């Protein structure tokens, strides 16, 4: 009594993906996960200037382009040998930051809430599905229902300007955006006049006031509606974080820092455990057991007999872990908004102060909205202070050559998830560079030993009480908020 | 009060020129879906999914038949009979699953337009999908439409991303030629098929630091003063109006804050290469 839904595309996530799920008695009992479009990034960077990576690796994607920069102006700054001053390290923090604040304030109402708020009767909010379980359908009070969706709505329609403000700000020391100019190996091209500082301030201000008044109250009540997806999209509660926004000038301390957790235990982050397995994904290793990524290879082979997606399946000590905000509000385990406390117990009966207060709601559907709201307000903080300390007339650049022949690798977390660019240098040209992106740790395929990829493992348990209105399919994949650019690059 | 349908399809992009468009002022982004467009299908921002979103896609491309604009973002693989870009997957009066390719998908929407619209560099001109390096047979629409023999109205309105001024713009004016062709003649375009009305300005001749490059005054690093031309700056080779448009609703622009890198050019990147070595 099995039946197969396929969705493709699977919309409202970033890039070209594929879901496919076996259901039966009302649950998902098995999954796929596919990437159906590659450039190969890796290819096109050989031989050019290293320098030009910061530019070329921000087309991977127009939504997260900050992150690839941060990655590879990191790995330039490292194999070029060149340290960033304390007012680069900052501004490089203020331009980024202030992309975490737009994007997962993009994710949320502009790719995520059309899973839960009924638009307008006009496109693109129609067609959706008929039965769509909406804050229409399960709130029984009639006008509770109206009154609580129409908050969700205009919280949507007030987050498109709230997101374009974000981008006033990364422009402001970023040059434009998408797609900045203004961070470089050395540091960055723009240093912050006080003027400039007060302008990026007055925005952040109207931002943060979003974030606290409106965007994490909305998150709150959403889940006290939608307390049963705080119950599934559970998956393997294995997470990964490698650091991001370094806080001193050393990379020794981090807003949010690296680790991993895997099977309830808590271990530090070695680099030297990631390898790439690509048994399902359209590509030719030369060697079997998976590769480290110093030494990846990107041979794309569409052809390839019983591969299914573009994405590689990245492991670590080979186990499959997940990333993005779930994954580095887990590892830090900070301690939650004025607002989550209050609503917890308001609205749920929770007593809660840290994220791991959550427990085993936090590995869900529902915790990973809680997760990216909580971290978008602990990064507004993180700004606020940044702001601050950010120095008027300070140098933010130092000079450099590009070296002969060199290896750097440039760590950071992009808003969805841990983030490193590999580059290696020979003759002065990039010899290697090879991504390991952050949804390609979520949207991976099965590795060789056919071990699902974190998505697929936690579509395992979704139910599918209405196989032609399969809604929670969709509302457990747009929970790892996916970018399938950056997943197959 | 009319509004332009629009089916916007994705290939080998990567979201920017969508997140541009996000990023519009005069009108904005909700004006613009609720008053100037009707987005019909766009899988970055639409309700449905899987086989609604594209059954919902054709229906609007035959009732629209030669009525809607075809927006193009991020270029057409060819290599490996077009699997290096699967659009979506459709299922037959019988059960069975078939693949979409972006080929096939432009192959199919193109002659049902009113008019293809290549927004951004990688749709226009094949940009970094096309590169140095790239094994895809990453294509741009006109090349593709060149093969294809395809003869349908072609706007490019590239950049990387382009402006919202510049895509807005365009779809304007030619919405408003299709209303009332002889008050609204469609836009000049050059060579490369881009309107003059964005791309005609060179950025060099239009530069504010045009005076300190004409005294030879160079920065020597990005945060001294002077012309950026040392630094890599690619305005004496670039028609675009960011001189006077400036970025996000005129906060800051390339070179002010580093240098040109000549993204709208049909040459970008290549042609534009290294980007910190001087032209
Ligand atoms: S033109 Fe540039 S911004 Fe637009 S899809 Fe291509 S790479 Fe992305
Ligand atoms: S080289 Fe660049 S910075 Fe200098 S005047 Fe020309 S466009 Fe302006
Ligand atoms: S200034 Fe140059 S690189 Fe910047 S948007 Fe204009 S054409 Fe593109
Ligand atoms: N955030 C983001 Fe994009 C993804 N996944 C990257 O890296
Ligand atoms: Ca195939
Ligand atoms: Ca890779
Ligand atoms: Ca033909
Ligand atoms: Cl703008
Ligand atoms: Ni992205
Ligand atoms: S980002």
């Given at each position: 009594?099995?039946?197969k ?63 690839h ?5 990191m ?19 203020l ?80 040059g ?24 990026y ?8 006031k ?59 982050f ?60 887990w ?42 709201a ?83 493992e ?17 509302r ?14 | ?20 468009l ?22 970055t ?130 919405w ?29 001749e ?74």
């Open positions: 009594g099995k039946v839904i396929s969705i493709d595309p699977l919309t409202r996530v970033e890039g070209h993906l594929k879901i496919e799920v076996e259901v039966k008695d009302g649950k998902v009992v098995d999954a796929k996960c596919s990437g159906g479009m590659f450039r190969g990034f890796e290819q096109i960077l050989r031989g050019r200037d290293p320098r030009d990576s910061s530019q070329i690796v921000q087309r991977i994607c127009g939504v997260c382009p900050t992150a920069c941060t990655a590879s102006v790995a330039q700054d490292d194999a070029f040998g060149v340290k960033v001053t304390t007012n680069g390290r900052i501004t490089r923090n331009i980024f930051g202030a992309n975490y604040l737009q994007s997962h304030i993009l994710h949320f109402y502009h790719l995520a809430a059309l899973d839960y708020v009924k638009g307008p009767d006009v496109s693109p909010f129609v067609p959706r599905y008929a039965n769509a379980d909406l804050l229409t359908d399960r709130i029984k009070d009639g006008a509770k229902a109206d009154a609580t969706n129409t908050y969700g709505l205009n919280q949507y329609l007030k987050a498109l300007e709230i997101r374009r403000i974000c981008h006033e700000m990364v422009a402001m020391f970023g434009r955006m998408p797609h900045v100019q203004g961070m470089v190996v050395g540091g960055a091209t723009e240093i912050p006049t006080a003027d400039k500082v007060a302008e301030a007055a925005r952040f201000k109207e931002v943060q979003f974030v606290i008044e409106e965007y994490l109250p909305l998150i709150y009540t959403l889940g006290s509606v939608y307390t049963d997806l705080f119950e599934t999209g559970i998956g393997w509660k294995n997470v990964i974080a490698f650091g991001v926004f370094p806080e001193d000038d050393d990379y020794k301390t981090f807003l949010l820092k690296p680790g991993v957790y895997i099977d309830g235990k808590d271990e530090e070695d680099s030297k455990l990631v390898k790439e397995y690509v048994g399902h994904s359209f590509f030719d290793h030369s060697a079997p057991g998976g590769l480290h990524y110093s030494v990846g290879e990107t041979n794309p082979n569409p052809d390839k007999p019983g591969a299914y997606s573009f994405v590689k399946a990245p492991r670590y000590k080979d186990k499959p872990c997940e990333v993005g905000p779930l994954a580095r509000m590892v830090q385990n900070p301690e939650l908004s004025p607002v989550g406390q209050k609503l917890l117990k308001e609205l749920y009966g929770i007593e809660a102060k840290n994220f791991r207060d959550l427990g085993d709601k936090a590995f869900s559907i529902m915790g990973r909205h809680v997760a990216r909580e971290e978008t307000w602990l990064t507004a903080v993180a700004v606020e202070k940044w702001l601050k300390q950010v120095q008027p007339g300070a140098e933010t650049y130092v000079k450099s050559e590009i070296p002969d022949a060199a290896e750097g690798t440039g760590f950071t977390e992009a808003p969805r998830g841990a983030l490193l660019h590999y580059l290696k240098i020979k003759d002065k040209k990039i010899e290697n560079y090879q991504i390991v992106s952050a949804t390609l740790w979520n949207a991976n395929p099965r590795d060789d030993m056919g071990q699902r990829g974190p998505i697929e936690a579509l395992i348990g979704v139910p599918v009480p209405d196989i032609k209105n399969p809604v929670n399919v969709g457990l994949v747009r929970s790892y908020d996916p970018x399938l650019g950056c997943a197959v690059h | 009060a009319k509004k332009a349908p629009v089916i916007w399809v994705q290939g080998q992009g990567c979201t920017g020129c969508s997140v541009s996000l990023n519009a002022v005069h009108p904005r982004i909700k004006e613009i879906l609720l008053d100037v467009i009707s987005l019909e299908f766009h899988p921002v639409m309700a449905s999914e899987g086989e609604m979103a594209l059954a919902h896609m054709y229906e609007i491309a035959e009732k629209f038949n030669g009525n809607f604009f075809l927006l193009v973002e991020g270029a057409i693989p060819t290599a490996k009979e077009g699997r290096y870009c699967i659009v979506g997957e459709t299922l037959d009066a019988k059960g069975h699953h078939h693949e979409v390719t972006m080929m096939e998908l432009i192959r199919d929407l193109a002659p049902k337009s009113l008019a293809t619209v290549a927004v951004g560099t990688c749709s226009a001109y094949g940009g970094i999908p096309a590169a140095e390096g790239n094994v895809t047979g990453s294509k741009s629409v006109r090349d593709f439409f060149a093969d294809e023999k395809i003869e349908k109205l072609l706007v490019n309105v590239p950049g990387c991303p382009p402006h919202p001024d510049w895509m807005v713009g365009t779809l304007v004016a030619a408003s030629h299709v209303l009332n062709p002889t008050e609204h003649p469609l836009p000049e375009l050059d060579d490369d098929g881009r309107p003059l009305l964005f791309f005609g300005d060179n950025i060099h239009n530069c504010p630091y045009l005076d300190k490059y004409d005294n030879s005054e160079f920065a020597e690093t990005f945060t001294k003063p002077g012309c950026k031309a040392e630094l890599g700056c690619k305005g004496p080779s670039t028609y675009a109006d960011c001189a006077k448009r400036r970025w996000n609703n005129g906060i800051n622009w390339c070179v002010e804050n580093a240098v040109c890198i000549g993204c709208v050019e049909p040459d970008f990147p290549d042609g534009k290469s290294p980007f910190y070595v001087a032209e």
